[PDB]
Amino acid sequence: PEWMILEAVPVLPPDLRPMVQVDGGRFATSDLNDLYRRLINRNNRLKKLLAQGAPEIIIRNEKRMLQEAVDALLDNGRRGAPVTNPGSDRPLRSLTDILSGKQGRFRQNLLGKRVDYSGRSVIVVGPQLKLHQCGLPKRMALELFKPFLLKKMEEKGIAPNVKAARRMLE
Amino acid sequence: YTGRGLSFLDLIQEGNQGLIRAVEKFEYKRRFKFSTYATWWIRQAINRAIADQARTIRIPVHMVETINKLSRTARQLQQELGREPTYEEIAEAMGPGWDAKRVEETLKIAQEPVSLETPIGDEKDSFYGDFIPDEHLPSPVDAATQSLLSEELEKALSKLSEREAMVLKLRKGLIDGREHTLEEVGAFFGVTRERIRQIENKALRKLKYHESRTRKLRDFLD
Amino acid sequence: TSVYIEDVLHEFSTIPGVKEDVVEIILNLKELVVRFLNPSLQTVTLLLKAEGPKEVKARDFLPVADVEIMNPDLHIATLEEGGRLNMEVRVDRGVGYVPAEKHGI
Amino acid sequence: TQGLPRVIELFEARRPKAKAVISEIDGVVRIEETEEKLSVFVESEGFSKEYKLPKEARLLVKDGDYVEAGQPLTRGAIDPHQLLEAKGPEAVERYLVEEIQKVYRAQGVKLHDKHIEIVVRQMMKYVEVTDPGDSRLLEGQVLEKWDVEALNERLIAEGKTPVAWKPLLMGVTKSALSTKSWLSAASFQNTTHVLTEAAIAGKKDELIGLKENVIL
Amino acid sequence: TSDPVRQYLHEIGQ
Amino acid sequence: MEIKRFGRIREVIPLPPLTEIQVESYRRALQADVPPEKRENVGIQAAFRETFPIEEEGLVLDFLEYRLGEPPFPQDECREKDLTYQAPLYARLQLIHKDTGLIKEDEVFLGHIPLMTEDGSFIINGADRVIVSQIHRSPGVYFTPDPARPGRYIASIIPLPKRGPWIDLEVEPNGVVSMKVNKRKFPLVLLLRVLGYDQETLARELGAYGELVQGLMDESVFAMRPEEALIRLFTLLRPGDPPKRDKAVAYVYGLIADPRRYDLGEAGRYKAEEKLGIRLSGRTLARFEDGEFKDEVFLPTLRYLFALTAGVPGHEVDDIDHLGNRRIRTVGELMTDQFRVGLARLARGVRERMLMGSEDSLTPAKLVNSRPLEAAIREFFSRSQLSQFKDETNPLSSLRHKRRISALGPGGLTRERAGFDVRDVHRTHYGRICPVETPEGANIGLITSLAAYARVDELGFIRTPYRRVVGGVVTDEVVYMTATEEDRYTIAQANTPLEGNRIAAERVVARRKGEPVIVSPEEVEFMDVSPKQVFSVNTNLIPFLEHDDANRALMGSNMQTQAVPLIRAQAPVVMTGLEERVVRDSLAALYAEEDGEVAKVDGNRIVVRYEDGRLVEYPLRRFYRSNQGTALDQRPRVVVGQRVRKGDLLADGPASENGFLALGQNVLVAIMPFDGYNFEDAIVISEELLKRDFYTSIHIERYEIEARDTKLGPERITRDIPHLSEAALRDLDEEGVVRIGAEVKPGDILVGRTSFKGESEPTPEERLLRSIFGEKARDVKDTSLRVPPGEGGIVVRTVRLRRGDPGVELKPGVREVVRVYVAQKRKLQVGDKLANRHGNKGVVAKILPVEDMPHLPDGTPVDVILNPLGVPSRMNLGQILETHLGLAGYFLGQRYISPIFDGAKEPEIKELLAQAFEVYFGKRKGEGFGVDKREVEVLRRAEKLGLVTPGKTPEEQLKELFLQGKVVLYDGRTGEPIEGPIVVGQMFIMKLYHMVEDKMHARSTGPYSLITQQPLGGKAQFGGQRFGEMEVWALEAYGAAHTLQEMLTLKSDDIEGRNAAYEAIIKGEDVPEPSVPESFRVLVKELQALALDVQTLDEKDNPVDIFEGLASK
């Protein structure tokens, strides 16, 4: 049961919560980063205050704040008021919200995932088709089977190499 | 001191922190009431904290201070000019060593990252990271081409003897990633650098002839 | 089959001194009727260069042998003071309806 | 009390607002619609059951009629859990399947009762302990009927007292969340709740279903 | 109690 | 094209200015025109009057006067350089240091306030936008019935949003009334005590009532002195602050009698005093004066509640959806509210800057910050949900968007806290909000549009016109009345027959409180104006609407807004009589201000002389890209020497004909099946339409690139690109930019930009490769803007902006910005979507040649074929009538205008048809031809079908069929007639935005997500198709385990498996076996970051590593 109390908090691999540079040249970070940093700020503040020694009243508040922070990291908005980064009244995303909801990992990236080799277009009626037939635009089928055609084209003299074949398609 | 990127309570913890140092240094011989000498460390601590804990990217306080005076001098212009300052106006208003380039430069450093979880559309069903690609990781086309290149490049080395190829492997760093100098390659084959150098040239040229019948590897150069 | 107008680059251009656009002009030039007397002819090239305040109709054009404009009073443009105008049309006798984005003369 | 709303109220095993009353024990209906108030007394051989009805309630039984236990006495919908405790599980299954089909048939939708029977079967998958007998089970502890039956036949084989159990009807949502696969339940709803309880118990998912394998 | 501000206020207000 | 007009009613008044609500409100808020001195306490004015004065309590700052300047840049230049049409905001601030006595004035520059154009739009960030009016419940006091308890009527004191918390009063079952506020309930007797009420006064007020007053009689409170009651009250409202009297009065007043935080509203006030029969001295619930609080509403409101609970007649409950209790927040109110927010945030900054700084030496210039107010307004116009991209597919697009009312938006409702009641069509909507126009989906009822003859008052209440009926006679006096006002009397309908100006009917159709009723003329008091008042503009633009179902009508009106401007656009042969008005008030068609002679005409400009002799060079718009991409271009319609009077056209706009709205084209349609090419709403077109260049429009696709400074090095735009054929730059100029007039196709380049490639170590292979051929890799890359697959067109413009170019500065870090404009004219094709004004929408599924098209006896081929099965279930017989009259028009060469509910009737259309049959047959009689044997066969069939009279001459039967709108149609494929007569005629069909060209998409392999590592989503991102749980369920049901696995691994986020699959295909290899997805690894690590030990195991219950010893130490 003591494991239900947390003394060592883990931190998710930085790739899973990064601050990459967008095309505009600006960088963009996950809310997890600002949550984790918030904890560190409070933790080291407390470590110093404790190591130095100072009125309990202060320490009490500080320890409480470290609690609230951990709570925001694990499940923001669950306790108290949602933690909000300065500027917008937007609650930050906690690990729970990453795993919970339709936008959560399960109902968004595990039970259902976007797939390659897949296209979309407006549909029309094909009375001439047979029941086991459909009408697939040629250019769609080009992309859809692109690798298969790269091979077939290579079998032919339509292309010198697969790369130049694809560049022909470009 | 609120509304500067930190909450009341965070700031308070900082002001109390400094207050303990102030109490440790306060002298009643001066005869000034505690409030007088205390405020100094109470304001310094909170103001320093705001400059230490308000940026996802740690930026020195002195830099923050420059940026602050940039906005101060700028707004002065904005309200006087009745319009809107530029890199070059503020630059001169700031003083010497201040140019428009420096303004824009400082603004570039001041640029702050934005949240990937930012809402897209009025339907909160989309986020920024959804519309941001992966540039780092092997893209199946890139990895495919590298597999093809190394295969064909080897097929070109199969058009050389293992000595010629191996020499090229070490020299170009295909043997073990690390490219080995001619003196090292001559240490491997027990051969004078000149002979190693010349057979490497002979090997490259032999590849060129074979290529002049194929040019398959040029495609990978693209 | 194709048309060149002076000082115009794209169909989406404008002609100062004129109430018509490049698009409307070419729309008028599809309404053109041409007679190739020699059956061994497959090509011709019409020209129209005029100005001044006058409603150019197809009466004004380049006369050529084996070239008969059945539709003379066909309005092609309206130009007023400083109504510059120059055109070079290519007429090809053919069959069916070949879209422009196929023949691209 | 009609349409898709009704289908959902049946599938979820929810107690209808216009819930009719049913006799707990069988007997003879003794109408007592005294001018002041309406009441009905089911007369058993040595027992008597008093059911008070709003004077406006529309009774579907006359006087001196054999009201079997679990039989409707007033017009309205039946609480499925009451029918389960009265007539037994077989009846609640029949009632649910037939009422759902009623809604679908009314719209003119043709659907084989099999599908509704599969769902209902899942709603009747768990049971409650009434006496642990010679087991670590606890009174009121809910569990899968298959597990209680298996442990029971094993206990009986060694000649131990059987584990008395009681049928438990629940809705689709609770039956799904109460599965033995924390992956499926966690992917459904109440993610935090499910996860905490599974981790505390050191739960393991044997990957018997589809959802779990799809996540993996 | 729900408002940590008011909490510090009373804690140091005694 | 003669225009005929039907109708038997006169419009006593015209249709109000269409964008009146959007222009009048914003004006009355800015008060820019009215002299700063005469300005009334409204808009930005009232905002300052509220925020100011700022008191330190000692530096003070009072408001003096504000002014609005002129914009640095014009609208067009704002759009070009992506600026904002806004005025310089200045106001007079002094700073009076009473302590010293010195005042210091300096007109302070607050910022720039956005300005609305002529049409009623904006150009925020250089892009046009619209601020949708928001609908909500009027502030005030309302008596609603407690649903839990039958005879309890909770009272609700609703204040203006963000202008006070809601106050609810309710007689608890405990016998004591209660005032619920901020989720806190307490006895009202105590507040009343603070107000100064005593048991005597209470008995004087409520003592007439039953035990109700008795429950209001708590002696403990009467004994508690008012101030004591106030301290006690505070201790109840919030006990944590030591209840110091000075603090108590502060909070209470600040929430009940503070005009700076609580403001019921002029409308709320009006409704409160007309509900309670009182008069208020201000928009405040109570009044704290002379050091004592004094009730103003609490007691009369309580009186009304108690009385309604008892059973007094004069007291009644109120409808919360009644348009008298529902008001509209015009653009002006919304702007002012965001203004007050930012201005109050500034005030807080000023208040903090007048204490830490040297108060003795301060000035308003050093005390005011421009960021708060600017950011507040910037946001309200930039990232507010009510501020949306303007709709300008066509003129009516903008008009509708600017006349659209939403109950959502910040400060409104969400699609989850919205029930039927708010979505329904209340009887008050009559002639106020269009009951047919609304989106189909979850927004239904939430997004609606304003009526036509209706208008919004100052209190934000819709108002419809009604003529005055007196003694049986009718006048032109148009009483614009509100809902609560229209209920007062009996209003008769417009169609009501009148003999001159007097009622001419024994029985008159009448509406009492919205309820239908028939009465005598003497009992009539008012009368409607016209039917048009009870519909929107888009809906009024649909003929034969009285013959269409509301669902399909909704579709038609909404689809009109989606009509692309066609190069050969034309007004409908059948019009309602509002198309020119639309073009007029759409501010897109040039007109003549006063009688004058047309100086010179040109496609670029038109010069006009007038009576005064003035010469104006009116500029024209030519091939201008719209917000939606439609090429909005104006075109000249007058010639030199033309004498244009006042209000005369000078140039047609986009999608317009002779100033009439031309959303589509009038074509010949036959209502019949055709080899299943009409199956399920599908449509068949004729190749002749493409040859005539019908349903063919121009589209401007704008592309953008910017060169910016990088730590790797500065980006530069150069024609030179490594390994790029000179033909690849054939159209690219020497700089790298394309040439105006050229064309591009997928695989081409628009602009060549090169950036510093990373210091990427040359891969061992490259080392060898490079050396083998003898070349050295560069330090610049091909970051050129290529052509997006599926896109193309002709370059029309190129705009290259660079540093050192005066006018605009490049965002910090940027070096230049270049925008290319590629336009393209497309004709109709398979997949393009057509619709009509009656709801019939469909996709082009077959483009047959004219020899296959069904043709008429004279030889004329039909243009479009429409399935007859799409009418019965949809119940939109209007299209039929439109076709019949179109047929008449087609032969009489005349267009028609039919008023809605008072237009062309069956008999009249048949008379016109009869005149056509002569032009369609009699000519034949004299041309040397008679009856065709095929016609005789069809007539035999019809004679059996009962469509013609047996015995009549063949001509007469053909006529009978023509009057029915039916003609003998032959099949061009066989030459044999259609066994029955078919409905042929003209119909108005519009080309819709939706076009297959912008939708077709495919992706074998491309961009993958950062974390999820799954294909991106969307076409513009070259994204894959979503395969959610529902599709997965389908595959599971089938039992396609391996297929599903593929979509879950190889085609998803098996980073390895997918690369291996691509290679396997190009090498004629079978695909690889799927390994664990990367997403499951994300889940494991995310759960471990949640201190949860999720581990994969095996048959031996021993751990298994899906990270293959890559995360283990």
Next chain:
Amino acid sequence: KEVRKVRIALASPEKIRSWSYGEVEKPETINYRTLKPERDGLFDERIFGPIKDYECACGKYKRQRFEGKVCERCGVEVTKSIVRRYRMGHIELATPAAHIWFVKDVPSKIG
């Protein structure tokens, strides 16, 4: 082996640290100027892993021959950079806090 079971259990403080490769000490991200891992930051390569395959920050080792070595001058290991997607960090606290899930999940398991 083949996965046939998936287990979930509370992690011991020792377990958390047994996973972690280090501890974030400073609330920092990348170099405010050079945009590179700040030491004791949340992206420090020395702990989580190299940003690039077989690539140390100092650049002493840039080959697969060096694979599996933490260069002493930089402090970064040599292997696949995908490690930054898996290798996890920790943050040791002097004062203990409670996992809100076990506190605010009625009925509170702790309580």
Next chain:
DNA sequence: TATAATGGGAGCTGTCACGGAT
């Protein structure tokens, strides 16, 4: 581094049905 300076600031209002704990 020193006149003295000692209880805050902003509130969101037009869902709801169910299961659970108090």
Next chain:
DNA sequence: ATCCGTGAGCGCAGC
């Protein structure tokens, strides 16, 4: 009895 926390259709597009 009351209050708290839980869920409340799928895409596409979204400049």
